[PDB]
């Protein structure tokens, strides 16, 4: 059928959901909190919409001795293998999506790093790297969901500035985006920050922290 069947949300990707965890660096792990603010997954397989599928807040705590909190607002897209395939170069050719572009080798390696794909049919030059078959379940019916998140604004301590790739804080820079993977069976999230000018594989780990509140 011409529609995606699910609001247009997931159990572990819905407005109001909070996650906690960390982002790694070579010296230590840093506390991270994420709040999902909006979720608007596509209704149509042949969608024309370019509106972000997810928005939220990302907070990193105790980053340097003199910087106790960095709060950003991010937007993002959920890979659906159709309008939004695994390879960014095959996303709609629209300037609003430029911040999510990477080399096809970068996308392929990062998605494969989460470790959930099969070993068959890999192809660097196919838009889903060979990993989406028409008998595959539609994206929301698979165990693992793939997303990219791009931070666009720096917020104040009460959740200020528009970010850009060439200006930064002492302790945090903003040139890249996150590859993200959500396990729909457990709610666990992993991610990797990526930009070619930055060291590879700063790793995000998150688990939902307010499921009890949402379920009561």
């Amino acid at each position: 059928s011409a529609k995606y069947t699910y609001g247009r949300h997931l159990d572990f990707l819905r407005p109001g959901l909070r996650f906690g965890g960390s982002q790694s660096s070579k010296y230590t792990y840093y506390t991270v909190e994420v709040k999902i603010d909006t979720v608007n997954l596509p209704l149509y397989k042949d969608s024309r919409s370019l509106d972000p599928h997810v928005t939220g807040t990302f907070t990193i705590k105790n980053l340097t001795p003199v910087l106790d909190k960095v709060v950003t607002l991010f937007e993002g897209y959920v890979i659906n293998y159709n309008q939004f395939p695994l390879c960014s170069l095959h996303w709609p050719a629209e300037e609003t999506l430029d911040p999510y572009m990477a080399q096809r080798e970068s996308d392929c390696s990062h998605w494969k790093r989460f470790g959930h794909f099969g070993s068959d049919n890999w192809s660097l030059t196919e838009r889903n790297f060979g990993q989406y078959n028409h008998e595959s379940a539609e994206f929301m019916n698979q165990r693992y969901i793939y997303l990219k998140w791009k931070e666009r604004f720096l917020l104040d301590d009460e959740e200020n500035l528009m970010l850009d790739d060439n200006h930064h804080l002492e302790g945090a820079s903003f040139e890249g985006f996150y590859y993200v993977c959500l396990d729909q069976l457990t709610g666990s999230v992993e991610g990797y920050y990526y930009h070619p000018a930055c060291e590879l594989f700063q790793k995000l780990e998150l688990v939902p922290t307010n499921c009890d509140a949402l379920n009561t």
Binding site: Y27, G171, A172, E199
Partner: peptide, 8 residues
């Protein structure tokens, strides 16, 4: 963000 913090 990308974390650039020095060891502390």
């Amino acid at each position: 963000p990308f974390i650039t913090s020095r060891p502390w």
